[PDB]
Ligand binder design. Structure first.
Ligand code: CLA
Ligand code: CLA
Ligand code: CLA
Ligand code: CLA
Ligand code: CLA
Ligand code: CLA
Ligand code: CLA
Ligand code: CLA
Ligand code: XAT
Ligand code: XAT
Lengths: 192, 222, 204, 81
């Protein structure tokens, strides 16, 4: 359905969340490889959805951006405010080796699960509010995959228009666009 | 039934036409099965030819690409430099990248080792790279019966060669372009020594005044 | 059968008698391969229609500017005038909007009768049965291209001929202002003043 | 340099050697010389497109010997005259 009228591929029918027939190349021909790629897609999408609010809320209050700190950054904890006035325990270390030591744990306890559908939608322990035990589960999976894809595109943006204007607000860019809608656009990096 | 370049009675005994680029050219008899050994044997020489040719395809299209793209004016001019001035040979020329070329070489050795050792282990023991766990994508790197043509979901993701005739013709085309690229890289090296400028500069010099810009006029080095 | 580009000749087999504007003019046999003919007729339809619009923005402005009712700049200098938007921004906005319209047309050409429905509202439909002539209330608000096949060929033939002439005229303006460094209408009113010393040869 | 005496000497020497080898006036891959300096025919096993039997190895050998002889003549004529 990504293109109206375009015939659906024989292995991409409207059964699983998404399934809009978007496979110009055909990387998911093998059913098992397709099943693995679906899980890869959900992991990427969930990471992107988590990341984007962490780049949208902080600056809106006027505390910098995701370019604020990735190397040689605020030593007195988190800047000087909000995240606790130099409250955070990991005050001085900026290249903080406690974050790439627990995501490894989350991986390691994640990998190694049978039942692909449960490999991807664990439920149970990971369903505190019990939304999965309902009749609209398929709709919810569709909504999750849709904002997941949107978040993936949004973070691709974040990356490219962080590399195109080194030092800027990925939402003060919206301010720049709104101040000059028809005068300042992507054209600056596309056509000078 | 086929074109013969410099065949012989000895060469034509074992060169029959199964290989893609098989034209009987074996004046030194290096692929004679009677004395097959470690690296001089029928199983390795075609594979080594294919690999040298593929790296030569990347080289001939890479040792001149920055210069061409800077001549047409879409990459920065300071990156539009001859291949030998890109830090590969620091004495003739050097470039400052994000890391010094020895750190880059160590990183290259690590990555190319992880790739090349796996390729070797699939050559010696076919299918052995699809068993042990490798970040979960060991199933893509299983390969096929022929070491030079894995053709997996990664190494073949547009899916060429569905039929055998087009597949074989495409093999022959690959071998020919690879031989051409190998000879081209040899030309790059010799012209770099004898001229001091990039291959595209040599091409443009020849295209400008062909009779006063050639090997005969230009073995004065400078 | 029909008047061809040459009075004495035989029309190419592929250009039998059907397409509007068919005069058997294919010396180079650039549509001999089966299937390519449909692509080319659509391609010429697109260029000619664009050229019609492009000629009305290259001559009519200068037409009612030299005598003087609008005071618009020249066609070959309008690419530098400052507008409310930016030149680069206008280019990119065009590219995306052109991408949508062009993509919808492409899907029609590849699969005829598949993009005939409005996406937002699946109730409005586009009246069209011939590829390259889609009607509806937007493209055909007056219903002047439906009915007997006879009048279809006439009006379609009238369409292409004006378009072919328009494509030729715009090519002139391009080359013909490039060497003379003067506006097209200025060339017209300088050619009827002293015709025998205002020619292509006397411009090098 | 094309009309120079060195160029003429080298071209003549190489052409003469190639002519002798091709037309059976000098030993080649398929033309063995016996102890009596008589030329007999042998099967070198190298297939060539030349109808007479001039091979690529024959061409390389004749060219190398022609260059050797031409260099000798050129340097000798330079040293003497
Ligand atoms: C739906 C996601 C999304 C959204 C809402 C935006 C929104 C914006 N982008 Mg970003 N962008 C995105 C995805 C997104 N981008 C992606 C995926 C890329 C990579 C191709 C970019 C690359 C990009 C650049 C390089 C630039 C913008 C710019 C802009 C601003 C106006 C021009 C524009 O719309 O760019 C249109 C972009 C595409 C059609 C792509 C605006 C704040 C411009 C700006 O104001 O930055 C300061 C600018 O220069 N964007
Ligand atoms: C990595 C290089 C490489 C390798 C391993 C092979 C291997 C092979 N080729 Mg290929 N080939 C190559 C390069 C190579 N070739 C190039 C560059 C050309 C173009 C000139 C060809 C043209 C060619 C034809 C036309 C044919 C082959 C054939 C063969 C097979 C017969 C055995 C053989 O060639 O000896 C093994 C070769 C080597 C071990 C390479 C040794 C190279 C030495 C060390 C140096 C070479 C000289 C050096 C460049 C200096 C140049 C000086 C001067 C000439 C400029 C075998 C599979 C025949 C065949 O059956 O096809 C499948 C056949 O018909 N090859
Ligand atoms: C195996 C083949 C090969 C190799 C070893 C190189 C090696 C190099 N190229 Mg060349 N190049 C090649 C093929 C190759 N190229 C081909 C096929 C093309 C055509 C597309 C080019 C086009 C090209 C251009 C236009 C430029 C280079 C440049 C460079 C240099 C730095 C680029 C780099 O690795 O950092 C950057 C690489 C990455 C960031 C990739 C890592 C993966 C990311 C994160 C995804 C380096 C000497 C640059 C140079 O000479 O600078 C002085 C340069 O400007 N290359
Ligand atoms: C891919 C093959 C290839 C191509 C297209 C060229 C092309 C060229 N070379 Mg290079 N060259 C090559 C291989 C090649 N060479 C190899 C293998 C060597 C090492 C022996 C050299 C060594 C070399 C030197 C030292 C010089 C050139 C020069 C030149 C220029 C021609 C003038 C001249 O004296 O040529 C001389 C050519 C040779 C000595 C090599 C001839 C034999 C090789 C195998 C080429 C055969 C060409 C063949 C028709 C295939 C072409 C493929 C395609 C274009 C159709 C021209 C840009 C000169 C230059 O830069 O001028 C300013 C120059 O000084 N070349
Ligand atoms: C790009 C514009 C374009 C295109 C795609 C076509 C395409 C077509 N025309 Mg049309 N035509 C055009 C411009 C064009 N024409 C112009 C400008 C004139 C007036 C001179 C005509 C006059 C004309 C007549 C009188 C007839 C056609 C016919 C045809 C058909 C057969 C010829 C063919 O396959 O063309 C293929 C064309 C190309 C691939 C374009 C190549 C352009 C080259 C590369 C550069 C030209 C440079 C130029 C000299 C400046 C085909 C549908 C015949 C028919 O039966 O159609 C129904 C017919 O009777 N055309
Ligand atoms: C509708 C077609 C059309 C018309 C009515 C005109 C009319 C005119 N042109 Mg233009 N011209 C055209 C197409 C046309 N041209 C095209 C397609 C080209 C590109 C080859 C040119 C290139 C051109 C140049 C370079 C010059 C003219 C000039 C002229 C004027 C004198 C005629 C002459 O010497 O050139 C006739 C040239 C032709 C190529 C004849 C083409 C006619 C067929 C029907 C097309 C006159 C106002 C001259 C001028 O400005 O004088 C005031 C001049 O210097 N024209
Ligand atoms: C001194 C004269 C002379 C020399 C040096 C050569 C040298 C050569 N000839 Mg021969 N040739 C000669 C006279 C000569 N030919 C004569 C008089 C004829 C008869 C018209 C031929 C007919 C001939 C044929 C038909 C072929 C050769 C081929 C060859 C080449 C073999 C590879 C080699 C360079 C072969 C060739 O080009 O292979 C590459 C080949 O096919 N030659
Ligand atoms: C036109 C024909 C011609 C002429 C005029 C000469 C003339 C000469 N040659 Mg040349 N030469 C020729 C053809 C010719 N050669 C040919 C066809 C070859 C074969 C490729 C050679 C190979 C050749 C070599 C290898 C050498 C000469 C040397 C000489 C010089 C002899 C001085 C000497 O040591 O002798 C007196 C020698 C002896 C009495 C014998 C010494 C005893 C043992 C061997 C020591 C003299 C200038 C020599 C030279 O240049 O020295 C300056 C030298 O080294 N020639
Ligand atoms: C691998 C290879 C080239 C690799 C090139 C590379 C990686 C280039 C890399 C770079 O450019 C880039 C990418 C980026 C730049 O910024 C930096 C560098 C680093 C410079 C060439 C092999 C090149 C290999 C060559 C040329 C081999 C030629 C072999 C021949 C001719 C053999 C002939 C015979 O064996 C037969 C056929 C039959 C026998 O019986 C008889 C004989 C005659 C012996
Ligand atoms: C679309 C087009 C041009 C349109 C122009 C537009 C929209 C824009 C105008 C402006 O932008 C400018 C310029 C400058 C701006 O500041 C202002 C505006 C106003 C914005 C012309 C097509 C041009 C198309 C032409 C002229 C086609 C040429 C073909 C010929 C003559 C010959 C070819 C063949 O004969 C062969 C070789 C073989 C035969 O079988 C078949 C045929 C195809 C007939």
């Amino acid at each position: 359905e990504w293109l109206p009228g375009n015939p659906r591929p024989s292995y991409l029918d409207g059964s699983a969340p998404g399934d809009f027939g978007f496979d110009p190349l055909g990387l998911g021909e093998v059913p098992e490889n397709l099943e693995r790629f679906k899980e890869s897609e959900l992991i990427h999408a969930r990471w992107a959805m988590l990341a984007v609010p962490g780049v949208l809320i902080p600056e809106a209050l006027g505390y910098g951006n995701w370019v604020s700190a990735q190397k040689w950054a605020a030593t007195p904890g988190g800047q000087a405010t909000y995240l606790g006035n130099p409250v955070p325990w990991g005050n001085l270390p900026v290249i903080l080796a406690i974050e790439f030591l627990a995501i490894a744990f989350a991986e390691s306890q994640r990998n190694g699960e049978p039942d692909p559908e449960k490999r991807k939608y664990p439920g149970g322990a990971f369903d505190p509010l019990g939304f999965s035990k309902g009749a609209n589960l398929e709709e919810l999976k569709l909504k999750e995959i849709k904002n997941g894809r949107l978040a993936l595109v949004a973070f691709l943006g974040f990356a490219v228009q962080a590399i195109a204007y080194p030092g800027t607000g990925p939402l003060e860019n919206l301010k720049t666009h709104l101040a000059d809608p028809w005068h300042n656009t992507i054209a600056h990096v596309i056509i000078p | 039934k086929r074109s013969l370049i410099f065949a012989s009675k000895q060469s034509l005994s074992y060169l029959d036409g199964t290989l893609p680029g098989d034209y009987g050219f074996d004046p030194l008899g290096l692929m004679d099965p009677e004395g097959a050994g470690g690296f001089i044997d029928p199983q390795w020489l075609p594979y080594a030819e294919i690999i040298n040719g593929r790296f030569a395809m990347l080289g001939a299209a890479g040792a001149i690409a920055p210069e061409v793209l800077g001549r047409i004016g879409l990459i920065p001019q300071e990156t539009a430099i001859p291949w030998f001035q890109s830090g590969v040979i620091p004495p003739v020329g050097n470039y400052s990248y994000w890391a010094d070329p020895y750190t880059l070489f160590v990183l290259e050795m690590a990555l190319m080792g992880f790739a090349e050792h796996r390729r070797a282990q699939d050559y010696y023991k076919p299918g052995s790279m699809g068993k042990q766990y490798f970040l979960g994508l060991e199933k893509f790197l299983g390969g096929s019966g022929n070491p030079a043509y894995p053709g997996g979901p990664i190494f073949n993701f547009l899916g060429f060669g569905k039929n055998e005739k087009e597949l074989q013709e495409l093999k022959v085309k690959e071998v020919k372009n690879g031989r051409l690229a190998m000879m081209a890289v040899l030309g790059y090296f010799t012209q770099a020594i004898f001229t001091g400028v990039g291959p595209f500069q040599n091409l443009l010099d020849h295209l400008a005044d062909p009779v006063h810009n050639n090997v005969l006029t230009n073995l004065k080095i400078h | 059968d029909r008047p061809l580009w040459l009075p004495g000749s035989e029309a190419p087999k592929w250009l039998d008698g059907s397409l509007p504007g068919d005069y058997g003019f294919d010396p180079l046999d650039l549509a001999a391969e089966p299937g390519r003919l449909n692509w080319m007729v659509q391609a010429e339809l697109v260029h000619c229609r664009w050229a019609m619009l492009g000629a009305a923005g290259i001559f009519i402005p200068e037409l009612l500017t030299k005598i003087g009712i609008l005071n618009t700049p020249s066609w070959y200098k309008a690419g530098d005038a400052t507008y409310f938007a930016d030149q680069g921004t206008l280019f990119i906005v065009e590219l995306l909007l052109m991408a949508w319209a062009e993509s919808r047309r492409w899907a029609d050409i590849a699969r005829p009768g598949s993009v005939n429905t409005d996406p937002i509202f699946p109730n409005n439909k586009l009246t069209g049965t011939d590829v390259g002539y889609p009607g509806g209330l937007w493209f055909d608000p007056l219903g002047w291209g439906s009915g007997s096949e006879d009048k279809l060929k006439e009006i379609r033939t009238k369409e292409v001929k004006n378009g072919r002439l328009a494509m030729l005229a715009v090519l002139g303006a391009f080359v013909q202002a490039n060497v003379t460094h003067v506006g097209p209408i200025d060339n017209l009113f300088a050619h009827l003043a002293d015709p025998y010393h205002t020619t292509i040869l006397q411009s090098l | 340099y094309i009309g120079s005496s060195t160029n003429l000497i080298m071209v003549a020497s190489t052409t003469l050697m190639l002519f002798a080898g091709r037309f059976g006036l000098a030993p080649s891959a398929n033309r063995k010389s016996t102890a009596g300096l008589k030329l007999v025919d042998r099967d070198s096993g190298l297939q060539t497109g030349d109808p007479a039997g001039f091979t690529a190895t024959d061409t390389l050998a004749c060219g190398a010997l022609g260059h050797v002889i031409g260099v000798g003549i050129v340097l000798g004529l330079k040293a003497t005259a």
